[PDB]
Amino acid sequence: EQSLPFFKLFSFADKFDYLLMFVGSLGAIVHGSSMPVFFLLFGQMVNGFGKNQMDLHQMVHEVSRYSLYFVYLGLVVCFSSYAEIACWMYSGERQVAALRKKYLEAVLKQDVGFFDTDARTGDIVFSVSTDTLLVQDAISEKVGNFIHYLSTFLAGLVVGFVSAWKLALLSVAVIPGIAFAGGLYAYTLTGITSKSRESYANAGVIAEQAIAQVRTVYSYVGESKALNAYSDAIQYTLKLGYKAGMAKGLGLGCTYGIACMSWALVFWYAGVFIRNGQTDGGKAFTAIFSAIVGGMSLGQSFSNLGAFSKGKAAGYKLMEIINQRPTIIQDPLDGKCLDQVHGNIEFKDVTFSYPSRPDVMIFRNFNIFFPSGKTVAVVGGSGSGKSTVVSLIERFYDPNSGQILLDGVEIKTLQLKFLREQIGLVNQEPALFATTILENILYGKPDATMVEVEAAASAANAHSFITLLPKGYDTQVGERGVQLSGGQKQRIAIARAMLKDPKILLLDQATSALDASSESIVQEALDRVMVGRTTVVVAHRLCTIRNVDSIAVIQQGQVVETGTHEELIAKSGAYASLIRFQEMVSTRLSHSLSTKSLSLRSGSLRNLSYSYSTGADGRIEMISNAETDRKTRAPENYFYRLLKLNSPEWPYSIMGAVGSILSGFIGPTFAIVMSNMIEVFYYTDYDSMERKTKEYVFIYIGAGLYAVGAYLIQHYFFSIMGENLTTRVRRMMLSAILRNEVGWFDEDEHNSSLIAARLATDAADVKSAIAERISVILQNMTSLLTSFIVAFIVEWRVSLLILGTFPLLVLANFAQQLSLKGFAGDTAKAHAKTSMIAGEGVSNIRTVAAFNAQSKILSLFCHELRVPQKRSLYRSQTSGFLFGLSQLALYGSEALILWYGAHLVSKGVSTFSKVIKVFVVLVITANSVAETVSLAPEIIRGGEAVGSVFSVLDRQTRIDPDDADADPVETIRGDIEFRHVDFAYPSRPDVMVFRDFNLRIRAGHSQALVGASGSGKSSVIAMIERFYDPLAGKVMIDGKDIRRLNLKSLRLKIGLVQQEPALFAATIFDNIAYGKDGATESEVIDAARAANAHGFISGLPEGYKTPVGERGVQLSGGQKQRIAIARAVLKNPTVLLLDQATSALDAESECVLQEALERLMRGRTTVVVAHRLSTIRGVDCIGVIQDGRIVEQGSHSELVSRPEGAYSRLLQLQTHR
């Protein structure tokens, strides 16, 4: 959408922020112009240390002077890298933490009708969680990196064009020659990676179907050919992944092969310009290296323009609510204030519709009257808009035509602090703000005294239940410290709505907890608060309204009938149908936020996003998404187990380890040939310098072709090894998911959107954990090792001093690589406790706006943004000082080497080019050792969260489909028998749907398990085949227990017909031959014409070939049912299972079932459940299930012969349509 400029993000800056962005913008320019000044001091040293080869007294006075200028260069990098980190991290905190205080003043003052849960308070909650962390990413510390490397470019050219300006043009013209082939590489690597993501989605839905339809893959045993259709469509991503390793070996060989053919260009013309008497060996070392590392420092300034475009998109969404004008506002002077109220509410000619869609008309000419000191009741039987009345006295909306008089005074002339001070609200599942249970009661009144809080808790049946809690009125209700965790809460709103002492009380449908004798406790507590108050009762069910003096009824836009409950039961006017209807009878925001966090979590950093959940019933819980540190949960032997799985490719690891050592010979050979030409440039024999610099250019060219052939071996191999592992792992993951029990799939984090991406993202990052972390170890440890053997043959007295310094030269190059990604780690973890206070002052704003609790959600937020500011003051002063102090041991220790080397030459021990060769080789080596120790924790710290997918391999199923020590099944005649069995669901173990259940189904009979409004009726077929095991008891089948048999050899002769039949994405020739392996045309045509649909199946364009499940032709609910019966007649089972429930007919003119329900049962033992009391006249036997028991058994001549029982009550519901 629209976007702000890059400025106006700095509009929350006070006068102390214009001082930290000025001291912190001299620290970014002085630290920038220090690497092109290091090349000016190290260049002028070599002129003093190497022109004086004949006078060893002029040497020592000109190396002792320039090695004092490195200690002076250290103190200017120490005190100016301190000033760009300690001043841009703390000034980027104080600006975003005053954006949070004005965005929350803005989102507490908009109208309450703005938040109607229609993905509106799932965007406000997301904009306070993540859009505020994108402004802080953009303006804090990636602005210091923008000024640092831009001024390294501008200072790298001025040092370059002053020393030697001809060599500063040959070294800049080379830079397009390197960035072209280093940028054309990155184009042709995304062109393979994007085709890999495209060629995977053919196999991305075959894994997806077998998880979301797992009950059908088990009943028809085809869990061994959901692998063979998944092991074929991965073989086109393996082969396309072989040529994304060759396009990297040719992309790094031909990028290191042009740079090596460009040091042969700049060091040949330097050898011509010295012989002409124009330069020397220190003005040319300066000019070449200052213009190369200066021009390369524009790839790091422009790397920050990606975060600068996220911080302008996110920052506009926040800045369009901060200055948004609401409608229903407070006027402190243009608003009256009455006294001695009485509570006479009257809607005089009010019409109103919700502003989400003005098409409907809820309140067409609405007219009521609420007396003083009395009780009323507003009741309906459908969506009549009776909860809208209590959502309109609060002024959450406006009546767009009409007026509302309070004691004859219009409420639009009263401000919104006198109206809401006299009205108290109680609503559904009341707001429990995550504080103690003294602070929640003190929202109705802030502080009067202590004894009134106990007095309000006394007359609510609330005093005893907070004294059987071993803490003194101080209990965490948000987190489960001490659990008042009953479904019957104490409705502590009633404790709030008594301490406030309102004159008008707006109750609501407060029977929403499956009411019983437990919920009758607060029923009389409501009868002890509705005294002397003009209260209303919005009643959902009429069973609790039966003692109310006056009741009004609305049906369509207006009131219909009023009066007491004697003429209400009389005359049958629009109330007798409602009492007939009484006889015949959040966790969603977390799914909205995580899918909004989906497709925005592969590009965004893991320390900048969240992951959402439900938590307890106190708040929405936010995990900082850098939980990989606190998890630390992989097996201790995970690195050997991923090598045992990756062994058949042992030739493709030996032939890549003689390609990773040969790449470690290119680095330490560049630093020998380049440090042999510093020596040669100080010759005075201008013909023996020409013929010895032709032989140092030919090495640069000949080893610029060695680099092409030694990165093609390292990266074509180790990609054959690493793409036969992510193919082998994904097959071992799907073959282990489709072996677990059914109840494992029923949980909330095992749905088919977080479990089919673990095979797509968490299974393809095992390549960069055991193949791309060996290639950069064999390479970097044969470069460290070949440069401590050469450098102890040349000279061992200087290189033993560098060996004692070497922990300090690798610690300074380790801090220079953490600074490319910033020193303000995991910034989403400190801003998690502060965000949940805004994350529940928005989703509970219907109770925040009531009680006038708006100035307390803001003072629990300004008083609690002080914790991440003292965490970001101590972290910026420390990390900014330890960075600059470790840059002082990098320049103050290269001045100890070059001084001790100059002392050996003047005593006649060493020579020139024995100190420079030892210096250049052992310093460039130190820049590679601090890359190996940067990936050193992740090898120990369990890989990471994506390399920790062993929980699908190392997991023990409860129901094992295949056993060797199990009896094989040859014939089941059908002997279904249930012994004393009770059962519950593992997803919710409190409900006890079965209680000593018993059946006995003889062979050659049927069964007609009755509806009974869902008394556990579609759970008997879920134990005939083991979708769930019982808690206690035995399931008897063929005179044997069911937990003794080969499960795969039992499910191929028990075939069900699903509740809502689903079809795979294929033709109607596989979906009618998935129930029998090997049938082609012989019994397939006959399997059509048994539940026939033959004109439906011959009337079709390509014969029996059309996609019907996904991305194909659409069928109806009556025709999909016809296909699933064709499976069950092709398979020809012995035990048949049917399942129909909860209005699943979905088609008038019922003929899709009447043909199949009588032909199919002629030789089988069938079990039939149907929710309607029609077409269920199975004349063998019929039983009734109630609360986990059978109550009556016998055919349909001993079932209606009893006068009532329980069956004839259901016979009354036949005429109740």
Ligand SMILES: Nc1ncnc2c1ncn2[C@@H]1O[C@H](COP(=O)(O)OP(=O)(O)OP(=O)(O)O)[C@@H](O)[C@H]1O
């Ligand atoms: N944000 C909204 N947009 C459109 N329609 C709404 C919105 N909120 C509520 N409604 C409608 O208002 C009606 C309110 O019905 P009613 O007053 O009888 O309350 P209820 O359905 O008994 O109880 P509850 O309000 O708890 O569902 C609903 O049928 C619903 O369709």
Ligand SMILES: Nc1ncnc2c1ncn2[C@@H]1O[C@H](COP(=O)(O)OP(=O)(O)OP(=O)(O)O)[C@@H](O)[C@H]1O
């Ligand atoms: N996997 C499950 N998860 C949660 N609750 C279940 C599960 N299976 C059964 N139940 C509970 O047990 C009862 C099952 O009754 P049954 O499924 O036989 O018919 P039904 O519930 O009327 O049909 P439907 O399940 O299609 O609504 C339901 O009320 C449900 O609350």
Ligand SMILES: [Mg+2]
């Ligand atoms: Mg509703």
Ligand SMILES: [Mg+2]
């Ligand atoms: Mg159900």
